[PDB]
Design a protein around this ligand. Structure first.
Ligand SMILES: Cc1cc2nc3c(=O)[nH]c(=O)nc-3n(C[C@H](O)[C@H](O)[C@H](O)COP(=O)(O)OP(=O)(O)OC[C@H]3O[C@@H](n4cnc5c(N)ncnc54)[C@H](O)[C@@H]3O)c2cc1C
Ligand SMILES: Cc1cc2nc3c(=O)[nH]c(=O)nc-3n(C[C@H](O)[C@H](O)[C@H](O)COP(=O)(O)OP(=O)(O)OC[C@H]3O[C@@H](n4cnc5c(N)ncnc54)[C@H](O)[C@@H]3O)c2cc1C
Ligand SMILES: Cc1cc2nc3c(=O)[nH]c(=O)nc-3n(C[C@H](O)[C@H](O)[C@H](O)COP(=O)(O)OP(=O)(O)OC[C@H]3O[C@@H](n4cnc5c(N)ncnc54)[C@H](O)[C@@H]3O)c2cc1C
Ligand SMILES: Cc1cc2nc3c(=O)[nH]c(=O)nc-3n(C[C@H](O)[C@H](O)[C@H](O)COP(=O)(O)OP(=O)(O)OC[C@H]3O[C@@H](n4cnc5c(N)ncnc54)[C@H](O)[C@@H]3O)c2cc1C
Lengths: 163, 158
């Protein structure tokens, strides 16, 4: 397309746009829980309510989401750093390292580390380089009070002010 | 609707940085808007996305010229965020800005970083368009990011 910025320049830029932190979960086609830490969550539209997440091609989580067409977005509170670490690290059995429950849909809900969970139906996808944007039409939301966890400038932080 | 309100309440609790996304329209006029939907998409090549309302002046400009700038606001930039989200006309007369060599508007006083992007694709979703921006050039300085979350502005705390 033309000149591209060096990957380190891009990483430095995007490190300076802080975000909340989710764990995006699903079941694979055999019913096994899958999930990953995800900071690339944003709102797409209100009609109907649709968010998006951007997941690596070949990841276990995207494989499950693509096959089953459902996923949950678990928004982490300020007590959820360890869950974010578990779900981005090398442990082979991540759901043994967090407290979690299964909703009627089967989707994993990190009910001790997340202050909100949105259950979503996949309504579309768009491949982009090594990743895929997944559009999720929100079907159900459970939300409680909590201070959001943040990630920015290569560090965890908490949203700094009370509700 | 009630479903829409529940969704707004959810997404309000996902805080973010704040950008002003700028472009030139097909007639050369600067356009832009406040944007919190900046999202990293991939590194091959480095590509971010934004979600812009269909029919917005900024989306029309981005679509016409196939380029845009993402100006990341520092914690002194609330006023620019308000100008670029509010109803009052003549936004560019209400901020100090300069033109990059490419022509794209750079909010030099309110932003700590500016990324110049080429539009590599667009996908409509409901009444919005997801715009994929392949990043071509970045100017970045130290700065403390402005944040927006829980229906308020704040500053990155570290
Ligand atoms: C703050 C933050 C934000 C992130 N945001 C995103 C995002 O938006 N999108 C995205 O795609 N990624 C993101 N990641 C990276 C993502 O969390 C990890 O790549 C995660 O490992 C993907 O898990 P998976 O099970 O889907 O994938 P896989 O890579 O398929 O991992 C399969 C399983 O292998 C194990 N495993 C994982 N990594 C290793 C390893 N290095 N060595 C050995 N075993 C391993 C785990 O049990 C994992 O469940 C983020 C990470 C962080 C820290
Ligand atoms: C959208 C996304 C995709 C990811 N894909 C992978 C992956 O394929 N394999 C893997 O092992 N880990 C992946 N990760 C995890 C990533 O490599 C970092 O470990 C994590 O983002 C935390 O990085 P850091 O901010 O502390 O610093 P850095 O690694 O310097 O990253 C700075 C910022 O750059 C962006 N970024 C970094 N890596 C990627 C990437 N691969 N794609 C898109 N944006 C990126 C993020 O916004 C991140 O916060 C991904 C993260 C994100 C947000
Ligand atoms: C924190 C935050 C984040 C946001 N994030 C996003 C995002 O990611 N995506 C998105 O699409 N929107 C977002 N918005 C909303 C967006 O900034 C505004 O809708 C903005 O007005 C769009 O500008 P435009 O010039 O492209 O639109 P237009 O509606 O085409 O407005 C044209 C011009 O008319 C004036 N004007 C604007 N609104 C009105 C009005 N209601 N009545 C009369 N004149 C008006 C302004 O001068 C504007 O430049 C966000 C707002 C906030 C506060
Ligand atoms: C991606 C995005 C798109 C937007 N599109 C428009 C638009 O088309 N017209 C307009 O006048 N203003 C739009 N806005 C501005 C928006 O309506 C709010 O005025 C602004 O986000 C500040 O709201 P708030 O967070 O304080 O509270 P709320 O209005 O409660 O919004 C909470 C969150 O809900 C989501 N959201 C709100 N409105 C929209 C929307 N219309 N489309 C998608 N997600 C939304 C965002 O994630 C926002 O942060 C948009 C904002 C964003 C982030």
């Amino acid at each position: 397309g033309g000149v591209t910025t060096e990957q380190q320049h891009y990483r430095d830029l995007m490190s300076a746009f802080p975000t909340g932190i989710a764990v995006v979960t699903s079941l694979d086609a055999q019913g096994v829980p899958r999930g990953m830490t995800c900071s690339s969550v944003t709102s797409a539209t209100l009609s109907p309510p649709t968010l998006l997440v951007c997941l690596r091609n070949g990841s276990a989580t995207l494989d499950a989401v693509s096959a089953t067409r459902g996923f949950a977005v678990n928004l982490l509170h300020d007590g959820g750093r360890h869950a974010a670490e578990v779900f981005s690290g090398p442990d082979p059995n991540r759901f043994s390292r967090v407290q979690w429950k299964q909703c009627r849909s089967g989707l994993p809900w990190l009910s001790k580390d997340a202050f909100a969970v949105a259950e979503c139906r996949v309504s579309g996808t768009q491949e982009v380089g090594d990743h895929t944007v997944v559009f999720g039409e929100v079907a159900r939301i459970a939300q409680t009070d909590g201070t959001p966890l943040l990630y920015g400038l290569r560090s965890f932080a908490a949203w700094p002010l009370p509700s």
